[PDB]
Design a protein around this ligand. Structure first.
Ligand code: ATP
Ligand code: ATP
Ligand code: ATP
Ligand code: CA
Ligand code: CA
Ligand code: CA
Ligand code: CA
Ligand code: CA
Ligand code: CA
Lengths: 311, 16, 311, 311, 16, 16
DNA sequence: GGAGGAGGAGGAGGAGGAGGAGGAGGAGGA
């Protein structure tokens, strides 16, 4: 896990300053090391010289230099991939939902964006031997469509204590885009105290469509969304969680486009396009990824979460 | 705020 | 290759001063010769008179005067062009990615900016006879989308030792724009010790969009980016590497514009615009170049990196 | 042509002093006559009385008094205008690039600043009957984007020996702003030995944007640029060459502004604003001139340099 | 910092 | 420094 | 032998970024 920011006191930082770094949202040594000098200057008590020392000492506790692709290939071969509860879907992702990265699932209505998030919320608690991440689940919800009964269904499938599964899912409802970003700062505080494997924002863009309604609010909208996505990457690098955001679609005027513009498209490393199949079956397509080929799969929404097409 | 049950650490889900 | 800065000691420079030039980021005689008098005065121990002597002696070891277009045409006819792994793409570039210069590739998501960088990271290690540069690869990554498994795929295509290919790619992840510039100073130290053919920053502008969010931070943003691009030109002139940066796009309000403003546009000598074709095929267009006509090509992203359209 | 500074020895100047004027950058009688008394006092061996004599004798060899607009209109009607390789562009300039003056071309990227400079570098060698200047070309380059292959293309269009054309283009690369000014002093030495028709600085302002990064370095930046432009005027008056500098642009916050401030705007007599047209066509606008009306033209970048719009 | 494997010089990739 | 080919005087480019 | 005093003079710009939004029936025959 990451190093708590208290470890800066054993390096020459006044504990009164570590407390000021705490109110700014920094709870780990990594979060302070990854931060720019500019970000620390914006804090009240921190001066130019303090940030230089705080960054210098943080730099010693976490490596921020060059390595070889060999060492990076070795370290990545040990990365956790949480199972999607579907063999055919896990094979498409070559293991499952990859941690330390932002995965985005978009599609029409009913295509299973909320249903995959409820399956992932449980299967992240499974032992790694069974395809999990052995961590808690954080579910930021912006639509009100979080159903704990859908978690209990997935728990029964994997034979887990439904009461214990509901104890490892931290749930927050976001009511606007300012709140949605505010909830991520509290997320950083919690992820130090307990081990989390997966973070879910559902939907990451739903509230942006109506908080910034105007024509001239477009730049301010994409800028605020860019900061939210930048903060999700922070949590993914800091704690190694798997960030899974969902996205809504739109119609092509000149046939389904995800909303959020180029900001959401450049930021997400894996983009999953979900279509409606027949009955309860759905089709997941690799829409963008650094390592996976543009392919398709066929999963299903069953009475016990997302599984393989039962036919 | 932080729920007193959300502050608790990850417990491995038992078998049922 | 370039001359190590130690050669200044055999010319009248106190080895205690060469050490001070070292902490300022100068490791070659060329880097000191190309530097302004102003840049050396900003160093602590260096005085006005020392910089005059240091510059005078550096001037003798590297030519900084006039020549003829004949001599320059002869010297340029011997310049290395690294293959893009695609015949149709190499023909568009009239040889491949040209060294000693800054090449920029921009486009929408999925259009192959990271995939070309992973192909270039391998094919730069090929012998010049096969279209390579016979040097190591440096991959500064600001998004987290560096996949060594995509390098092993390109290695198999060219029948190279995947373990040896991963040993010639130096990888660093940048977490903010200050770190991104800091990594270039360490790059200058490494490029003296070993032979590098290619430097990759992917993406060179991704972090600038959110480190400088404000409206009044725009000048400070483009100024910090201008210094980063000025330092990339330094490495390209000092070591003769091929600098390949990537860029993200934006929507036209009044249809895809690269971000970074006029700073990135004036600085990059070759600009490559990548579009999405059909299936796995992509379209690369010459967007700006001193010598290449505004034309197009059609490459593809295959299971073994960037290649020609397989159809 | 101008008179070599050796002609001062036949007028009462000790040849040991003419040698001291040589190290200060004076190689012609005109350069010494146009110089202030203050500039000669700053030389080591020269005293107050010597400079008085040196200036008095130099004053006799070159006319520095009043004439009539008639005599000046007659002398100007014999001035050389180098062709831009485009009929529509030459008509906008009423003849071409006018010698003995500073012409500045600015615009966005790709708009043809480097391409016009490569066409001008060849067409300055044409006989005056064909629209040239019958002189060599000097190309100070601060970006690294000098392509001798683009000269050979323009040579074929005018049916000139490509080998001989590359022998008449003196090329120097500037790495910082101090070097850029230093190269102009060597330019003054060369322009006495051989006949030059055109001097090109591309770009004259690119390096100033990053050599003087700070907020408080702004005055020192514009002062150093003012001296460089003052020295370009010196070469234009001394040798009668056509000085063609290029400039980069910037965005308007409150739509494209040339950089360099009021210094570059007051100093350049003709300012050419280049826009991007359609395909390979560009639009050149008279942005400032003492004699030309504010008009526009449409040229094109072709496989043989700058020519007329082929359509 | 510099990785001890990144400090090593360029070795020509063998054939496989 | 001055290139020995740049010190040479302007030669009229021949026809090709 | 002795016995101080007199201010003044401005200047120098630069920097882009940002998508999104469906919809609409019809037409007998051997
Ligand atoms: N217990 C269940 N058993 C079977 N199918 C179910 C069950 N619960 C929901 N579904 C089905 O799953 C789909 C709902 O998917 P989901 O909640 O993920 O939607 P979504 O993609 O988030 O949509 P939206 O954009 O409207 O929020 C519907 O087809 C619904 O009938
Ligand atoms: N092994 C593979 N085989 C085939 N196609 C692949 C493979 N890996 C990735 N791709 C495809 O390559 C594309 C990804 O391109 P790349 O990683 O270069 O994106 P990018 O231009 O950097 O995008 P972004 O702005 O999102 O970072 C996708 O279309 C993906 O499906
Ligand atoms: N041989 C050629 N044939 C046709 N078009 C060409 C050729 N070489 C370059 N071009 C085009 O000319 C343009 C490049 O112009 P140029 O080199 O003058 O740029 P610039 O104005 O100096 O830009 P920057 O500010 O980036 O340096 C591009 O549109 C490029 O495609
Ligand atoms: Ca939903
Ligand atoms: Ca992406
Ligand atoms: Ca990428
Ligand atoms: Ca450019
Ligand atoms: Ca140029
Ligand atoms: Ca003017």
């Amino acid at each position: 896990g990451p190093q708590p920011i208290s470890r800066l006191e054993q390096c020459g930082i006044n504990a009164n300053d570590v407390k000021k770094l705490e109110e700014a949202g920094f709870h780990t040594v990594e979060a302070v090391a990854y931060a720019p000098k500019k970000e620390l200057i914006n804090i009240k008590g921190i001066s130019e010289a303090k940030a230089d020392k705080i960054l210098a000492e943080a730099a010693k506790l976490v490596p921020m230099g060059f390595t070889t692709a060999t060492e990076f290939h070795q370290r990545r071969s040990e990365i956790i991939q949480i199972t999607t509860g579907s063999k055919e879907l896990d094979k498409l992702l070559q293991g499952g939902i990859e941690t330390g990265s932002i995965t985005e699932m978009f599609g029409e209505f009913r295509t299973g964006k909320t249903q995959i998030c409820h399956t992932l919320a449980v299967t992240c608690q499974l032992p790694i031997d069974r395809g999990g991440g052995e961590g808690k689940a954080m579910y930021i919800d912006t639509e009100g469509t979080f159903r704990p009964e859908r978690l209990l269904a997935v728990a029964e499938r994997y034979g887990l204590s439904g009461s214990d599964v509901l104890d490892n899912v931290a749930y927050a409802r976001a009511f606007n885009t300012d709140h949605q970003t505010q909830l991520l700062y509290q997320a950083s505080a919690m992820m130090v105290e307990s081990r989390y494997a997966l973070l879910i924002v559902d939907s990451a863009t739903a509230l942006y469509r109506t908080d910034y309604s105007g024509r001239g609010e477009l730049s301010a909208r994409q800028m605020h969304l860019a900061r939210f996505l930048r903060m999700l990457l922070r949590l993914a690098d800091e704690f190694g969680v798997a960030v899974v955001i969902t996205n809504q679609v739109v119609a092509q005027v000149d046939p389904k486009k995800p909303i959020g513009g180029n900001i959401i498209a450049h930021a997400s490393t894996t983009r999953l396009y979900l279509r409606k199949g027949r009955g309860e079956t759905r089709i997941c397509k690799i829409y963008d990824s650094p390592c996976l080929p543009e392919a398709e799969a066929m999963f299903a929404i069953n009475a016990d979460g997302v599984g393989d097409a039962k036919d | 705020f932080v729920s007193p049950a959300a502050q608790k650490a990850f417990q491995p889900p038992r078998s049922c």
